[PDB]
Amino acid sequence: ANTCSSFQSDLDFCSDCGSVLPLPGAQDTVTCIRCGFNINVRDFEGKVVKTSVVFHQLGT
Amino acid sequence: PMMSVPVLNTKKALKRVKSLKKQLTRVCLGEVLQKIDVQEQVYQLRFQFLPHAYYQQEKCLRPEDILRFMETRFFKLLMESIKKKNNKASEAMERRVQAVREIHPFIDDYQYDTEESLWCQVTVKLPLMKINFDMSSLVVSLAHGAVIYATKGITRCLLNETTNNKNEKELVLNTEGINLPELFKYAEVLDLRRLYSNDIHAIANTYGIEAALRVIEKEIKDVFAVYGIAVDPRHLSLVADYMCFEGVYKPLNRFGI
Amino acid sequence: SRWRNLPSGPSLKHLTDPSYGIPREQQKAALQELTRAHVESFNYAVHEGLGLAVQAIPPFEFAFKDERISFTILDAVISPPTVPKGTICKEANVYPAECRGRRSTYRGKLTADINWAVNGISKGIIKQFLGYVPIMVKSKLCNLRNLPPQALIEHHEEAEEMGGYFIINGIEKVIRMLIMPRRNFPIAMIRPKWKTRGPGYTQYGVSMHCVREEHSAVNMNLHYLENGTVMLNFIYRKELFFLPLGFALKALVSFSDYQIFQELIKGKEDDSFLRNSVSQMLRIVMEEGCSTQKQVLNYLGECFRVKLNVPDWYPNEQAAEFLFNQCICIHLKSNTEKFYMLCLMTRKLFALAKGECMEDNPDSLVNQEVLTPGQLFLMFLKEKLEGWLVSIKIAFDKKAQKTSVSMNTDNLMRIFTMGIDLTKPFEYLFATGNLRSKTGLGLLQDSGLCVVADKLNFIRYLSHFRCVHRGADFAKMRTTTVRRLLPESWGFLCPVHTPDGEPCGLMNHLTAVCEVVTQFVYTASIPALLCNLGVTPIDGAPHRSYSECYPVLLDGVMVGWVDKDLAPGIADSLRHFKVLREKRIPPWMEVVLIPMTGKPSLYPGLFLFTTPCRLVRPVQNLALGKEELIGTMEQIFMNVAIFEDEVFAGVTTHQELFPHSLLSVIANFIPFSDHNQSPRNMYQCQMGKQ
Amino acid sequence: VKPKADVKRQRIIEESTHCGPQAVRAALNLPEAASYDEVRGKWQDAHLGKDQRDFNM
Amino acid sequence: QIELEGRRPPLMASGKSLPCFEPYEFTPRAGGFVTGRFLTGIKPPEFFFHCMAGREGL
Amino acid sequence: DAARFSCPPNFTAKPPASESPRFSLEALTGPDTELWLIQAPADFAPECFNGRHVPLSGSQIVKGKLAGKRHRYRVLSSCPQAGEATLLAPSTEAG
Amino acid sequence: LPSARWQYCGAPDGSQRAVLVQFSNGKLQSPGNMRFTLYENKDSTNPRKRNQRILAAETDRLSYVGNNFGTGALKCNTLCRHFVGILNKTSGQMEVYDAELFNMQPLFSD
RNA sequence: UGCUGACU
DNA sequence: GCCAGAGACAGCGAGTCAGCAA
DNA sequence: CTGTCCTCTGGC
Numbered sequence A: 001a002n003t004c005s006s007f008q009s010d011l012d013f014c015s016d017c018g019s020v021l022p023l024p025g026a027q028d029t030v031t032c033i034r035c036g037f038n039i040n041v042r043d044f045e046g047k048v049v050k051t052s053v054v055f056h057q058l059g060t
Numbered sequence B: 001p002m003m004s005v006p007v008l009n010t011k012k013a014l015k016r017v018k019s020l021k022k023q024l025t026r027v028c029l030g031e032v033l034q035k036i037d038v039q040e041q042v043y044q045l046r047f048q049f050l051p052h053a054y055y056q057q058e059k060c061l062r063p064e065d066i067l068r069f070m071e072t073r074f075f076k077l078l079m080e081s082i083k084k085k086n087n088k089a090s091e092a093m094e095r096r097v098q099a100v101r102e103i104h105p106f107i108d109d110y111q112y113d114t115e116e117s118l119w120c121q122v123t124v125k126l127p128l129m130k131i132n133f134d135m136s137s138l139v140v141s142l143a144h145g146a147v148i149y150a151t152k153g154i155t156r157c158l159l160n161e162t163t164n165n166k167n168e169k170e171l172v173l174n175t176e177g178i179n180l181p182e183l184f185k186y187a188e189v190l191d192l193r194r195l196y197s198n199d200i201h202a203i204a205n206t207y208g209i210e211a212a213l214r215v216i217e218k219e220i221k222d223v224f225a226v227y228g229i230a231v232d233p234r235h236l237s238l239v240a241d242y243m244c245f246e247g248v249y250k251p252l253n254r255f256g257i
Numbered sequence C: 001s002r003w004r005n006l007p008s009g010p011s012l013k014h015l016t017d018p019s020y021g022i023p024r025e026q027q028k029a030a031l032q033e034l035t036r037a038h039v040e041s042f043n044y045a046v047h048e049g050l051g052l053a054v055q056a057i058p059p060f061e062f063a064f065k066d067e068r069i070s071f072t073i074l075d076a077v078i079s080p081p082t083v084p085k086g087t088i089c090k091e092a093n094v095y096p097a098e099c100r101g102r103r104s105t106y107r108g109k110l111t112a113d114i115n116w117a118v119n120g121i122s123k124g125i126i127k128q129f130l131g132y133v134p135i136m137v138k139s140k141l142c143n144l145r146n147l148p149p150q151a152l153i154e155h156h157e158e159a160e161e162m163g164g165y166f167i168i169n170g171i172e173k174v175i176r177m178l179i180m181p182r183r184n185f186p187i188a189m190i191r192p193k194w195k196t197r198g199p200g201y202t203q204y205g206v207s208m209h210c211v212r213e214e215h216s217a218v219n220m221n222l223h224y225l226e227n228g229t230v231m232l233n234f235i236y237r238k239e240l241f242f243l244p245l246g247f248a249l250k251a252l253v254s255f256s257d258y259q260i261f262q263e264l265i266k267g268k269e270d271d272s273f274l275r276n277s278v279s280q281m282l283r284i285v286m287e288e289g290c291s292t293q294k295q296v297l298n299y300l301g302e303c304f305r306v307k308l309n310v311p312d313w314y315p316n317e318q319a320a321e322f323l324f325n326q327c328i329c330i331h332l333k334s335n336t337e338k339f340y341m342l343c344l345m346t347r348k349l350f351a352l353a354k355g356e357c358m359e360d361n362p363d364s365l366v367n368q369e370v371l372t373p374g375q376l377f378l379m380f381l382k383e384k385l386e387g388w389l390v391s392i393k394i395a396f397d398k399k400a401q402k403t404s405v406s407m408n409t410d411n412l413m414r415i416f417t418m419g420i421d422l423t424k425p426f427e428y429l430f431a432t433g434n435l436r437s438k439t440g441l442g443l444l445q446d447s448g449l450c451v452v453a454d455k456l457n458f459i460r461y462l463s464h465f466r467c468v469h470r471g472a473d474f475a476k477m478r479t480t481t482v483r484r485l486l487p488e489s490w491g492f493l494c495p496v497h498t499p500d501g502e503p504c505g506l507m508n509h510l511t512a513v514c515e516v517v518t519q520f521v522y523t524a525s526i527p528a529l530l531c532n533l534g535v536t537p538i539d540g541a542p543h544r545s546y547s548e549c550y551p552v553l554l555d556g557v558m559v560g561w562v563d564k565d566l567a568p569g570i571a572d573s574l575r576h577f578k579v580l581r582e583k584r585i586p587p588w589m590e591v592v593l594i595p596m597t598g599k600p601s602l603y604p605g606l607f608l609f610t611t612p613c614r615l616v617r618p619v620q621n622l623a624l625g626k627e628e629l630i631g632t633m634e635q636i637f638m639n640v641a642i643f644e645d646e647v648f649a650g651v652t653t654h655q656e657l658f659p660h661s662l663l664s665v666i667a668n669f670i671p672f673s674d675h676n677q678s679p680r681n682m683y684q685c686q687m688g689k690q
Numbered sequence D: 001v002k003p004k005a006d007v008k009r010q011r012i013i014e015e016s017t018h019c020g021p022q023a024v025r026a027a028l029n030l031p032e033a034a035s036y037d038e039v040r041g042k043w044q045d046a047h048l049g050k051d052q053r054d055f056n057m
Numbered sequence E: 001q002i003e004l005e006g007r008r009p010p011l012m013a014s015g016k017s018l019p020c021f022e023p024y025e026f027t028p029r030a031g032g033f034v035t036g037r038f039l040t041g042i043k044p045p046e047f048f049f050h051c052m053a054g055r056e057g058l
Numbered sequence F: 001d002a003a004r005f006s007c008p009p010n011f012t013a014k015p016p017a018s019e020s021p022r023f024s025l026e027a028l029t030g031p032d033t034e035l036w037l038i039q040a041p042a043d044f045a046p047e048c049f050n051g052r053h054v055p056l057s058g059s060q061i062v063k064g065k066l067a068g069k070r071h072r073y074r075v076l077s078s079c080p081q082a083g084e085a086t087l088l089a090p091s092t093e094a095g
Numbered sequence G: 001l002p003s004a005r006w007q008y009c010g011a012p013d014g015s016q017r018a019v020l021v022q023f024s025n026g027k028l029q030s031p032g033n034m035r036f037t038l039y040e041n042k043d044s045t046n047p048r049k050r051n052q053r054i055l056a057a058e059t060d061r062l063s064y065v066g067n068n069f070g071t072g073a074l075k076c077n078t079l080c081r082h083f084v085g086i087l088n089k090t091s092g093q094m095e096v097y098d099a100e101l102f103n104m105q106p107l108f109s110d
Numbered sequence H: 001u002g003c004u005g006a007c008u
Numbered sequence I: 001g002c003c004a005g006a007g008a009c010a011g012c013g014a015g016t017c018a019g020c021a022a
Numbered sequence J: 001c002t003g004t005c006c007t008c009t010g011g012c
């Protein structure tokens, strides 16, 4: 029960994209849980610090 | 493509040219950026622009202009590209924010940076069903071809200090793009007679065909000169007179016959 | 060794010796090792490789009347040349001395024993005579094998000959080593003409050239599409077919879609465009209708049934297996191993797409191998045997479709009705040089495959068995980048020996110390040894993060994930085994370890090649002094001094045997080549052959 | 070539075998000194780069 | 100084220009600077670069 | 309905061992007991380590004797990584 | 560095084996609700079949099955060997036993 | 005509 | 009606000598 | 392998 947000987590296959509130039971083994997950998947990412930047590259 | 206008040899012109060189080089959003911070259907974006210490020196830019650019051009080209993807998928801070969201229905509120662009992010959201992926790809492929401001056709200037020994005092403002009219405004800083370009179609459109004949001849001569070869001018005269016979610079190839 | 007893300075007291004309007891042994790659390849192709070739040969079942008949080829045997039938007298053998006097082919008899059954309870083993296949001169199926120089003079032969050629109409065709991309190794390429393959394809993709037991080759391309999705292009019978990945991965393995996913995100489990695009591969085209291995095999079976020309009474699930067996990853028997190999080639396209890896130049010898005379011979033999089956049963189905019960009376009169085929097709490939095949043999070239070997001089002749042709198509190209003499052909190709006109840079020659690998070994105790050394099997418990681990491959089969701080010691241990001939490591395995840094260097990982067509060259292994053999890709990660006093303590892992090892055999006949300018040593090499 | 003139040639060839670090370093605009391995890394980065115009420099 | 495309000889994929030279070696010898003459011949590594140049010429 | 695993006819359920109190859940949950997963080459003879002090952290070379020949085994000890094999033990609670 | 005295009490005939399970789709947060049943082949005369085993795990929603034979049997069960060590913290003694690893997978039939 | 060598 | 999407489409040095197979 | 056509196609 720790496969994340795109797989049945008790069956196996992958779920489909969200439309109605309930977890979109897969075409196989339609068991449902967590209609809408608690937190929207948040992503922390940025770019590089050599070429795009003129900062971080005063000397070195 | 290139250009070469001599600099007029006056004390005022020498001073104005520094600003001219710094005025025609292209400054692009990507050349002024540190790194983006994208959070994701509610997609936030903080640009985090560079300090002026090492880019204002030779680009002639200011932070209000740069940021105003994001509000009016980048933050709407962003929705333009979002639609490009989603069509085939299946006291004063206040007025600026308000006019900006007057024009678009997705943004919510950006930021303000009263101290040298400290933290300037934006927030979007498409709540029903959109392909939530690492859209950083889009907002990075777009933050490269996004240029603050540039003269059409010119990519960079440079003043090759000396070009003569006889009258060593000559200065030349060479360029690596081609826009003839966008130099006509500096007839007092630069000598617009003595203007030269290797294009031969642009010369033929600003000065005529009898002026493109001589550019053709000089181009062939300078091509042969780099190897020490020297074809007699009487041959290049005939070639240039035949090419430009009927009023246009016509190619010497299968479509010219 | 094999380069000892090399003369220290030349002598002149060998001429003017009391024994100058007496034919010697055994042949020279340095001249013999020149055509050795041409003969040791054929020796396999005709005896040990022919059995394997016929073993694949799926039994050709088809419908007669209301009956289904099965024909399998149990063995095929090529016999030394001999007087035709017994209609001749006094000597059964036939020696190459004639067919040069007369103008004829030195051809041996190819005969197989087919076994035809009707439902599997009625069967009879008939022995048909397929045809005639040409024979090499000193090739184990020739009559001049095991003859000393004195007995080789009473048959009219050179007393110093090394055959390595064919006599097709008395002309001595010399089929020469062509250059192939590589075998059983995924090469990540950036080719801009790939985005024309479809609507959203990019200019990124890993190509793999698969060879099974030297009888079959196939080329498969994994393409990156802009959506983050990967496609698979396969070619069957010269037609290109595109299957989304996911259709292939679900068919090969009966695993959940999360387990397939956990595999394609092994080293980049923090990236989110990838995690999202793996799911769009598994769900977008596979949760659309097929979610069990059988339904995927059934859907794939129906779309491809028409062009795979499968039997009509075959379930669609059986027609899918036919596609996977004959078109994708020929080299691997398992379907689980075929899954792990398609997953590492994808894990690599994702790194090339995200600029985490450097495109592999297809024109560097690092990513190149040679096509020997035995690979072309068997790959044509196998295809022609399959064609013979097909033609005999075309005749079968077409004659009468009539009550086979009594028709078992003319069964042999039937098989012979199409056994009249296999002879002339084979001589065309040898007399003309160009290839007429339904599948081009995974080759890319269909002409100039065999060439005339002309004895104008013995320096023109000896250079036909050391030539390596980049390809005959590259003689027609605007850009000249396959003519660059890169620094990776140091010791493997001669810098000076290249034709100096239209063929320049395209026709190269091997150095004197370089050699082609031709032996075949067991390589079964190697996967069990790698695990003792420190590797952890593909199944699990890597002990680190899948990013601080090297993906171990051994001949197309991913053993899997040697830890990052155990990879160096493992590579050094494996190199010590091959040098001292311990374990069963072939003396010529290439232990490569492409290190991983944060830079966009070549994709990291510990490879271990032992295949039969790579080029190797000897170098004195310092720290052991035991004459190691290194390969084209293994030589890029090691320092090899040339002269002593150039050897250092930490640097100089290896050392070269002689200082002139870099030069070819002919370029070693030019006197003082060091004091002449180089374009003059290139003309001397071409003038010594006229 | 005269002897007593090949000695100068040999000494100049010996001197020429020490001009790589300074050349590359002062072309990467690196700290003038104190970096002997940062220079190799900067050269490697410039070599595996995409633009490849800091390598031609 | 050997020059192939207007540039020094190319490096391998590992950062060495020739199997004899350490990766990213600073010496000019590793970049095609031949100090040998045809009077007293040139060593093997220099022979290699000279052949590269003479071949690109053709 | 969950299609319930159906045992093939040539297989029979193995009863628990009531003669096994060692791998009993009770024995394994004792405050002084720790469980370790060990992975070794297929030809590894565990008896060669009898009496020898295997490390509980880091990397160490351990010498073993098998059939008169000295073997040295690099032993790597680590922190369990999420997703590791779970040990099954007989439980009286589970019928 | 902390060390343990190694002892292979192991299996009396080697017939005895422990049982390790690994799930192909990840972890079970709290599997306390799982019932495992180990099945063995009835054929004890065939050396090939006598070591064939099936492990079945039943939940309320799905079934998992692992086997040590056939495609589901994976390479790690042989190329490498698995053991379980039981460490007595007080004595510093580690008892080592043979283990069999089962890769578990979900159950459905047409 | 073709194709494989070769010459300036 | 304005101008990108392409997707065909055409061009690719001069002369010379052989042999071999169809 | 590049540059113009240049004939659609397609969207606007």
Ligand SMILES: Nc1ccn([C@@H]2O[C@H](COP(=O)(O)CP(=O)(O)OP(=O)(O)O)[C@@H](O)[C@H]2O)c(=O)n1
Binding pocket: H008
């Ligand atoms: N494919 C070709 C090859 C050659 N030629 C012609 O032959 C001449 C001499 O070739 P060459 O190769 O001997 C050059 P050369 O300067 O004489 O050589 P050197 O430095 O050793 O003295 C060329 O300049 C061309 O006129 C041609 O038309 N097509």
